[PDB]
Design an enzyme around this catalytic site. Sequence first.
Site, PDB file in Angstrom:
ATOM      1  CG  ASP A   1     -10.998  21.212  -2.166  1.00  0.00           C
ATOM      2  OD1 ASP A   1     -11.147  20.794  -1.614  1.00  0.00           O
ATOM      3  OD2 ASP A   1     -10.426  21.087  -3.016  1.00  0.00           O
TER       4      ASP A   1
ATOM      5  CD  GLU B   1      -6.671  24.381   4.223  1.00  0.00           C
ATOM      6  OE1 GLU B   1      -7.268  24.028   4.219  1.00  0.00           O
ATOM      7  OE2 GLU B   1      -5.357  24.495   3.890  1.00  0.00           O
TER       8      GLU B   1
ATOM      9  CB  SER C   1     -13.246  22.260  -5.736  1.00  0.00           C
ATOM     10  OG  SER C   1     -13.603  23.069  -7.819  1.00  0.00           O
TER      11      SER C   1
HETATM   12 ZN   LIG Z   1      -6.277  24.263   1.891  1.00  0.00          ZN
END
Ligand SMILES: [Zn+2]
Lengths: 335, 338
Positions: free
Chosen positions: B107, B172, B60
């Site tokens: 991420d 996303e 991340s």
């Molecule tokens: Zn997400």
Amino acid sequence: PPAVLSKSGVIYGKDVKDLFDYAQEKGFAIPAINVTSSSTVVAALEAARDNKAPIILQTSQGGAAYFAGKGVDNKDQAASIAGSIAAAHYIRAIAPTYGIPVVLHTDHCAKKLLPWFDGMLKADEEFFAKTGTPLFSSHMLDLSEETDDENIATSAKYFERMAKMGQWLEMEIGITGGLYTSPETVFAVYESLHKISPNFSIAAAFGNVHVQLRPEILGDHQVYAKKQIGTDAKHPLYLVFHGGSGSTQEEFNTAIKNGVVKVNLDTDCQYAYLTGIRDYVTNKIEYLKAPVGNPEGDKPNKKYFDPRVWVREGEKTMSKRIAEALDIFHTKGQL
Amino acid sequence: PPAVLSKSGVIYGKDVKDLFDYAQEKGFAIPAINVTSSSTVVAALEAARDNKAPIILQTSQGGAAYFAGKGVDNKDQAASIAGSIAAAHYIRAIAPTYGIPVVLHTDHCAKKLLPWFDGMLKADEEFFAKTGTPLFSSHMLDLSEETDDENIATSAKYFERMAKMGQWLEMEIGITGGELYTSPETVFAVYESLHKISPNFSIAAAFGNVHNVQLRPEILGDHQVYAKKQIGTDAKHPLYLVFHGGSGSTQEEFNTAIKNGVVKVNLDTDCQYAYLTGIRDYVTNKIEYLKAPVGNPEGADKPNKKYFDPRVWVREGEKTMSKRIAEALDIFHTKGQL
Ligand SMILES: [Zn+2]
Ligand SMILES: Nc1ccc(NC(=O)c2ccccc2[SeH])cc1
Ligand SMILES: Nc1ccc(NC(=O)c2ccccc2[SeH])cc1
Ligand SMILES: [Zn+2]
């Protein structure tokens, strides 16, 4: 004022010698931090950068295999090799970000671990062939339990190969021979290795257990070699201070005056890194998945168990410890 | 029986697509584990080698900044960039030793954090021209909070740079509009625009996976059915889908998602907690955890070195993290797939 002092990242070649000469000219030693993880690497570089100091990061044989992971079979040194290589790449990648020169070194290697040495060297040669520098700045041999003749011969053999990449060698001699290390013994180490390259440092047995510390014997080595070479140099040798923790500032002071450039003290750092994480024993009530004394039966203990929170406490407490060493060894501010 | 199932180390390019196609066909997903340290990399790689499974490792934004050190100022995403790069070299360097294919991923990267994404792609490109392969196997973009056509548009431009290197993009998309669950229409819009560039992309839709609304892995089937008819193919899975952050979902909710074509599942909290436990359970040796003076045998005459050595206690957190990962590799039927 050598260029090395204004560099950032891992240093090689002449930059290592210039750094160690500067240490001897200006009267300071550089601590050598065993690192076992990206997290201990981070704590060392941060302590060094915040105190505007150069630093030595080293992997021991076990540290290097911990970098590989303890579940990796190490019967044939494959984990110490692969892990020392992975730590080397990591450290090289992040070390420039801390704005300081870094000596990337490997720690004690006795005769039965020479396959680990062998694996690093091959990797160094490979790297050297395609980039112009080796992968590691420096390597140590500790054949101090062998006969001094054998120790010196084997060191020299490896050193020839190491000198092709201008790589530094640290070597340890003890009291075996064929009580402290006699100055004439140290000089025989110098006589063989100086024939090959000047890039080498010596860790002698001067009461540093690892019945009393005799740092002044390091001066007798320097004086003996002074008269043999016929030089006016105060410090014909580069000397290294191993273990024997609990030595006071005066002891470190006579050792540094006698030409010590590097000090290893790994129990201090190991213990230091624990304390900050260990004292996260006060938050034990908040250290289960949901259930916390503070409020909720129902609270999310995620802000408490996140390793980024608690591991940083060990980093913080290790870095402070290294900051002390940096002042004690007069290496703080030296850039 | 694709080649990638037999490789050791970080994989790239088509090996990534092969891995995911094989996940989709044998009905498993692969856990994506957040790493923040060599120790946590070791734990994940060991659990994957021990259970003969492929695995995804990811940093991340905060994990990458951790690999650089919290002491490193991150106002311009500087710590996140150096740290993920340094994690990449370390992971690439050690992964071959564990003998399993490793997807090296990054991420959630939102609009405000794109400098980190820029700095990573910059380093992938230099590394690519030096070696023929990027540093990272894949990168994630999360611009779901931006208008949907703006998301597909920034993601198309970045995906066109990554496709020169054969790099995988995970994007996303949420419930935002621009001209409640992500609609199959909206999901297909993404596939429409990205598939023109390269096939190496996966999609994270909003299907009740909080991170009002209930978890609905059945809509991800709606996504596949919608795309499949809109394309004309007769294969079950024209989309690569990923399951983000599924706090305590059932085995059946996961099975529904996997059979609707999810290849990748991440849930960060559990691992974090599991790593802690092993180290937290070295609270039973507190009395041995101050220098030199031990309760058990002899104060100021029995040394504590052998217990406060970080090589000992950190291993404990590694071991309990890998046990949890091992349980996750069972749950997602990824165990033993090599
Ligand atoms: Zn997400
Ligand atoms: N009070 C005191 C006593 C000793 C030291 N020395 C060190 O820590 C040290 C030395 C070398 C390498 C690593 C460390 Se943590 C520092 C402070
Ligand atoms: N009993 C049980 C329940 C859930 C899970 N899932 C995970 O752990 C997981 C999933 C994805 C990523 C990382 C982990 Se540690 C594993 C075991
Ligand atoms: Zn020694």
